Amino acid sequence: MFKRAIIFTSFNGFEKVSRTEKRRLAKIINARVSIIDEYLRAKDTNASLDGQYRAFLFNDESPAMTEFLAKLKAFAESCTGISIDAWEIEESEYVRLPVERRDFLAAANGKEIFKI
Amino acid sequence: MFKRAIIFTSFNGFEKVSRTEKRRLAKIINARVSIIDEYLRAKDTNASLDGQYRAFLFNDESPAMTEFLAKLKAFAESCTGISIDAWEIEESEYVRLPVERRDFLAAANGKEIFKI
């Protein structure tokens, strides 16, 4: 029940992504990133947000994950210029993936949560 | 072989910039500011760092320009509150630019390196 939430955020090209929308999405991400995985931190920039995988560790028995994902889902529904894809994968299953290219391979081997 | 690295540092407004972050960026900049070039020297203040161009002379036969650009990029990536744009221009082209707004014009006429 330890699972990685793999989110792929991208700019879909059908609308300009505004400063407020980049800020909001980087804020949502950074409310879950702690001092121990600073490497998942986001900036409100194209380079940080457009075309990037982030894999967050979640224990699904807790309502954290489900709350995190609903913020994401509702935000992506509010923002036509940003697509968000999300997959859950068992952590036990994830730790044994190749170190290089890992997040894409987890997303192809994972359960589709949503796809906005 | 002689080039200028043009850098534009700014506080992007996503996050507060701490004093230690200001000092760390000033220290990275000042590693390439000798005692002769006091005009380039970075202070740990908004006036000195927030919204300022600086143009560093380099000889591209040395790896010094690349290691400094690497240290800058790494800093900007880990500090959510600071943006750094970097361009490169030929020294012969840099000295035939008008003196006023030269670094601005050099950035305009320059080859883009990163925007983090």
Short mmCIF file of all heavy atoms in Angstrom, two decimals, chain A residues 19 22-27 30 38 41-45 47, chain B residues 12-15 76-84 115-116:
data_model
loop_
_atom_site.label_atom_id
_atom_site.label_comp_id
_atom_site.label_asym_id
_atom_site.label_seq_id
_atom_site.Cartn_x
_atom_site.Cartn_y
_atom_site.Cartn_z
N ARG A 19 0.87 33.25 -15.78
CA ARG A 19 1.72 33.31 -14.58
C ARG A 19 1.02 32.75 -13.35
O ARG A 19 1.61 31.99 -12.57
CB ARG A 19 2.16 34.76 -14.32
CG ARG A 19 3.31 35.23 -15.20
CD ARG A 19 3.59 36.71 -14.96
NE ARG A 19 4.59 36.86 -13.92
CZ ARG A 19 5.90 36.88 -14.15
NH1 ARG A 19 6.36 36.78 -15.39
NH2 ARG A 19 6.74 36.99 -13.13
N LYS A 22 0.93 28.88 -13.64
CA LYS A 22 2.23 28.29 -13.32
C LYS A 22 2.53 28.37 -11.82
O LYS A 22 3.03 27.41 -11.22
CB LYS A 22 3.36 28.97 -14.11
CG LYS A 22 3.42 28.66 -15.61
CD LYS A 22 4.52 29.51 -16.29
CE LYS A 22 4.12 29.84 -17.74
NZ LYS A 22 5.11 30.73 -18.43
N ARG A 23 2.22 29.51 -11.20
CA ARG A 23 2.43 29.64 -9.76
C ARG A 23 1.60 28.61 -8.99
O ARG A 23 2.12 27.91 -8.12
CB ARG A 23 2.10 31.05 -9.30
CG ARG A 23 2.32 31.24 -7.81
CD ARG A 23 1.85 32.61 -7.33
NE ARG A 23 2.08 32.77 -5.90
CZ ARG A 23 3.15 33.35 -5.37
NH1 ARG A 23 4.11 33.83 -6.15
NH2 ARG A 23 3.26 33.44 -4.05
N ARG A 24 0.30 28.51 -9.32
CA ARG A 24 -0.61 27.61 -8.62
C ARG A 24 -0.15 26.17 -8.72
O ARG A 24 -0.16 25.43 -7.72
CB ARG A 24 -2.03 27.75 -9.20
CG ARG A 24 -3.06 26.71 -8.70
CD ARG A 24 -3.84 27.20 -7.47
NE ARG A 24 -4.20 26.14 -6.52
CZ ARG A 24 -3.45 25.81 -5.46
NH1 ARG A 24 -2.29 26.43 -5.27
NH2 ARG A 24 -3.84 24.85 -4.63
N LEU A 25 0.27 25.74 -9.91
CA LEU A 25 0.68 24.35 -10.06
C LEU A 25 1.99 24.08 -9.33
O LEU A 25 2.13 23.02 -8.71
CB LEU A 25 0.81 23.99 -11.55
CG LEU A 25 1.43 22.62 -11.82
CD1 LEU A 25 0.49 21.49 -11.36
CD2 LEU A 25 1.81 22.44 -13.29
N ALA A 26 2.94 25.02 -9.37
CA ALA A 26 4.17 24.81 -8.61
C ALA A 26 3.92 24.86 -7.10
O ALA A 26 4.60 24.16 -6.35
CB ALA A 26 5.25 25.83 -9.02
N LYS A 27 2.94 25.66 -6.64
CA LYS A 27 2.56 25.70 -5.23
C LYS A 27 1.95 24.38 -4.77
O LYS A 27 2.25 23.90 -3.67
CB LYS A 27 1.56 26.83 -5.00
CG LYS A 27 2.07 28.05 -4.29
CD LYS A 27 3.55 28.28 -4.47
CE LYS A 27 3.98 29.58 -3.76
NZ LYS A 27 5.41 29.62 -3.31
N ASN A 30 4.69 21.87 -4.42
CA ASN A 30 5.60 22.15 -3.32
C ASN A 30 4.94 21.99 -1.95
O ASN A 30 5.66 21.89 -0.96
CB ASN A 30 6.20 23.54 -3.50
CG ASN A 30 7.14 23.62 -4.70
OD1 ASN A 30 7.55 22.59 -5.24
ND2 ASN A 30 7.48 24.82 -5.11
N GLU A 38 13.91 17.40 -1.94
CA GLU A 38 13.94 18.69 -2.63
C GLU A 38 14.04 18.54 -4.14
O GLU A 38 13.63 19.45 -4.87
CB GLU A 38 15.10 19.54 -2.11
CG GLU A 38 14.92 21.03 -2.38
CD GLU A 38 15.80 21.55 -3.54
OE1 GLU A 38 16.87 20.95 -3.80
OE2 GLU A 38 15.40 22.54 -4.19
N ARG A 41 11.02 19.43 -6.16
CA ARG A 41 10.51 20.79 -6.06
C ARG A 41 10.21 21.37 -7.44
O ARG A 41 10.84 21.01 -8.44
CB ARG A 41 11.52 21.69 -5.33
CG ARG A 41 10.90 22.89 -4.62
CD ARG A 41 11.39 23.00 -3.17
NE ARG A 41 10.45 23.68 -2.27
CZ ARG A 41 9.54 23.07 -1.50
NH1 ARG A 41 9.43 21.74 -1.48
NH2 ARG A 41 8.74 23.79 -0.73
N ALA A 42 9.27 22.30 -7.48
CA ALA A 42 8.86 22.95 -8.72
C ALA A 42 9.10 24.45 -8.66
O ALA A 42 9.02 25.08 -7.60
CB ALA A 42 7.39 22.69 -9.05
N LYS A 43 9.41 25.03 -9.82
CA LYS A 43 9.38 26.46 -10.03
C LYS A 43 8.21 26.80 -10.95
O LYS A 43 7.72 25.94 -11.70
CB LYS A 43 10.72 26.95 -10.61
CG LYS A 43 11.91 26.75 -9.62
CD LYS A 43 13.25 27.26 -10.16
CE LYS A 43 13.33 28.78 -10.21
NZ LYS A 43 14.70 29.26 -10.65
N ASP A 44 7.74 28.03 -10.86
CA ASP A 44 6.65 28.47 -11.72
C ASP A 44 7.14 28.83 -13.12
O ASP A 44 6.88 29.94 -13.61
CB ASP A 44 5.91 29.66 -11.09
CG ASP A 44 6.79 30.88 -10.85
OD1 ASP A 44 8.04 30.74 -10.76
OD2 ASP A 44 6.23 31.99 -10.73
N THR A 45 7.84 27.90 -13.78
CA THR A 45 8.46 28.14 -15.07
C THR A 45 8.14 27.01 -16.05
O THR A 45 7.84 25.87 -15.64
CB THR A 45 9.98 28.26 -14.96
OG1 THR A 45 10.52 26.99 -14.57
CG2 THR A 45 10.39 29.33 -13.93
N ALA A 47 10.35 25.50 -17.94
CA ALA A 47 11.37 24.47 -17.78
C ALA A 47 11.06 23.53 -16.61
O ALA A 47 11.27 22.32 -16.71
CB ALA A 47 12.74 25.11 -17.60
N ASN B 12 12.12 36.49 -8.83
CA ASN B 12 10.95 36.25 -9.69
C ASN B 12 9.61 36.45 -8.98
O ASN B 12 8.59 36.59 -9.67
CB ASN B 12 10.99 34.83 -10.27
CG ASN B 12 11.11 33.77 -9.20
OD1 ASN B 12 10.47 33.87 -8.14
ND2 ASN B 12 11.94 32.77 -9.45
N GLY B 13 9.58 36.50 -7.65
CA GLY B 13 8.35 36.73 -6.91
C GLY B 13 7.58 35.47 -6.53
O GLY B 13 6.57 35.57 -5.81
N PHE B 14 8.03 34.30 -6.98
CA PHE B 14 7.41 33.05 -6.57
C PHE B 14 7.64 32.75 -5.10
O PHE B 14 6.78 32.17 -4.43
CB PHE B 14 7.97 31.91 -7.43
CG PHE B 14 7.43 30.55 -7.06
CD1 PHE B 14 6.13 30.20 -7.37
CD2 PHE B 14 8.24 29.63 -6.42
CE1 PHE B 14 5.63 28.94 -7.04
CE2 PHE B 14 7.77 28.37 -6.09
CZ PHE B 14 6.45 28.03 -6.40
N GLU B 15 8.80 33.14 -4.57
CA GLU B 15 9.21 32.77 -3.23
C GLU B 15 10.11 33.87 -2.70
O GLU B 15 10.81 34.54 -3.48
CB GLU B 15 9.94 31.42 -3.24
CG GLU B 15 10.47 30.94 -1.87
CD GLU B 15 9.36 30.65 -0.85
OE1 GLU B 15 8.67 29.62 -0.96
OE2 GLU B 15 9.19 31.46 0.09
N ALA B 76 20.44 28.39 -9.61
CA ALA B 76 19.11 28.82 -10.01
C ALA B 76 18.09 27.68 -9.94
O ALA B 76 16.92 27.92 -9.62
CB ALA B 76 19.14 29.41 -11.42
N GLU B 77 18.52 26.45 -10.23
CA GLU B 77 17.60 25.31 -10.19
C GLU B 77 17.15 25.01 -8.77
O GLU B 77 15.99 24.65 -8.56
CB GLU B 77 18.26 24.08 -10.81
CG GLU B 77 18.07 23.97 -12.30
CD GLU B 77 18.93 22.89 -12.90
OE1 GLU B 77 19.62 22.21 -12.11
OE2 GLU B 77 18.92 22.72 -14.15
N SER B 78 18.03 25.15 -7.78
CA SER B 78 17.67 24.81 -6.41
C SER B 78 17.02 25.96 -5.64
O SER B 78 16.46 25.73 -4.57
CB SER B 78 18.90 24.33 -5.64
OG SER B 78 19.79 25.42 -5.39
N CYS B 79 17.06 27.18 -6.15
CA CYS B 79 16.51 28.33 -5.44
C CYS B 79 15.26 28.82 -6.17
O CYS B 79 15.36 29.46 -7.23
CB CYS B 79 17.55 29.44 -5.33
SG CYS B 79 16.88 30.98 -4.69
N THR B 80 14.09 28.52 -5.61
CA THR B 80 12.84 28.81 -6.31
C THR B 80 12.59 30.31 -6.50
O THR B 80 11.78 30.68 -7.35
CB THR B 80 11.65 28.20 -5.56
OG1 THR B 80 11.58 28.76 -4.25
CG2 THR B 80 11.80 26.67 -5.44
N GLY B 81 13.27 31.18 -5.74
CA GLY B 81 12.94 32.59 -5.77
C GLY B 81 13.74 33.42 -6.73
O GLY B 81 13.43 34.61 -6.94
N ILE B 82 14.76 32.83 -7.33
CA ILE B 82 15.72 33.55 -8.16
C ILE B 82 15.69 32.97 -9.56
O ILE B 82 15.68 31.75 -9.75
CB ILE B 82 17.14 33.46 -7.56
CG1 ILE B 82 17.14 34.13 -6.18
CG2 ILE B 82 18.14 34.10 -8.53
CD1 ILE B 82 18.51 34.16 -5.48
N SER B 83 15.65 33.85 -10.55
CA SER B 83 15.78 33.47 -11.96
C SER B 83 17.12 33.94 -12.48
O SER B 83 17.58 35.04 -12.13
CB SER B 83 14.67 34.08 -12.82
OG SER B 83 13.40 33.79 -12.28
N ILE B 84 17.74 33.13 -13.33
CA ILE B 84 18.98 33.51 -13.98
C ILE B 84 18.88 33.19 -15.47
O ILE B 84 18.70 32.03 -15.84
CB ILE B 84 20.21 32.81 -13.38
CG1 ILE B 84 20.24 32.93 -11.84
CG2 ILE B 84 21.48 33.36 -14.02
CD1 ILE B 84 21.62 32.67 -11.21
N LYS B 115 17.72 29.75 -19.40
CA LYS B 115 16.83 30.62 -18.61
C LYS B 115 16.23 29.72 -17.54
O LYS B 115 15.35 28.92 -17.85
CB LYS B 115 15.74 31.26 -19.47
CG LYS B 115 16.21 32.05 -20.67
CD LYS B 115 15.05 32.63 -21.45
CE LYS B 115 15.23 34.11 -21.76
NZ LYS B 115 16.49 34.40 -22.46
N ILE B 116 16.71 29.83 -16.30
CA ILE B 116 16.28 28.90 -15.24
C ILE B 116 15.48 29.61 -14.16
O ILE B 116 15.65 30.82 -13.96
CB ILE B 116 17.47 28.18 -14.60
CG1 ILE B 116 18.32 27.49 -15.66
CG2 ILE B 116 16.98 27.18 -13.54
CD1 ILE B 116 17.56 26.48 -16.47
#
